[PDB]
Ligand binder design. Sequence first.
Ligand code: TD2
Lengths: 132, 136
Amino acid sequence: PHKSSLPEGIRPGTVLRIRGLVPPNASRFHVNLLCGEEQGSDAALHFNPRLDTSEVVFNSKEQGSWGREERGPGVPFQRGQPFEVLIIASDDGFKAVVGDAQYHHFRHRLPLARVRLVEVGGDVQLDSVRIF
Amino acid sequence: MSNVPHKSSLPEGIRPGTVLRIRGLVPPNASRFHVNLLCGEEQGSDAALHFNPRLDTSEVVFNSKEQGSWGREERGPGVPFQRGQPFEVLIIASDDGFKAVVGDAQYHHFRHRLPLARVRLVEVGGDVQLDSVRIF
Ligand SMILES: OC[C@H]1O[C@@H](S[C@@H]2O[C@H](CO)[C@H](O)[C@H](n3cc(-c4cccc(F)c4)nn3)[C@H]2O)[C@H](O)[C@@H](n2cc(-c3cccc(F)c3)nn2)[C@H]1O
């Protein structure tokens, strides 16, 4: 599970670029925006491609409890294939970009200013995480 | 074949947290090309951002145009573009300005001079062969 601290926190205009490879046998993987380095910290954003059930789940976690799932059938990832994801913080939410198209817009639940790090876990080969 | 340009409207304008992703090739004998964030489709439209890699003079110029008049030019550090080489540029809008990212590295920050809400059009032209222009 990769972790990268956000160099100047996050505001509208912060961009995370995540390049990686989905393993041939992958079940799921996730990208989290967390509000602290301690285990169980609140997640302002949880981006969760599920290859074994062909869906994507978006959610947040507050006080060890998950929120309302923003989910849907289909997944813009394929086992064995490389990807490039953008997570873009906007004034009213996070835009999740996969490949050449915005896949979802996740409206803010937690205060944007509380986000401290990015976590990448689950079944994924991470090539790079860049923060612009 | 020809240079391949781009024009696309931004009906809802752009807001803080918008990414313009531009991928393309600078052709062998390129002089210069541009990326413009314009306020309308009229010729000579005001420009919130004029981003102008000049291969011929080895500079990258940033400017605005307001009420028909150009602002003071800003110049980035060196030229992260080469004739015969492909590139990727991100133009990222924030509350405070535009960040230009070129090939994996932060390149320049251009503070807003015009209100971001006025932007309604993106045009890419000049000596460039565009792979893709995407706005997120
Ligand atoms: O929200 C995000 C969270 O989701 C749950 S699974 C979730 O749990 C619920 C239980 O009440 C529901 O069963 C829910 N659900 C609704 C439907 C449904 C409802 C209606 C219609 C229809 F079609 C289908 N199907 N399933 C599940 O998605 C994951 O465990 C969790 N997570 C994963 C990890 C994790 C961390 C590290 C490594 C790792 F492998 C996993 N750490 N937290 C996190 O990703």
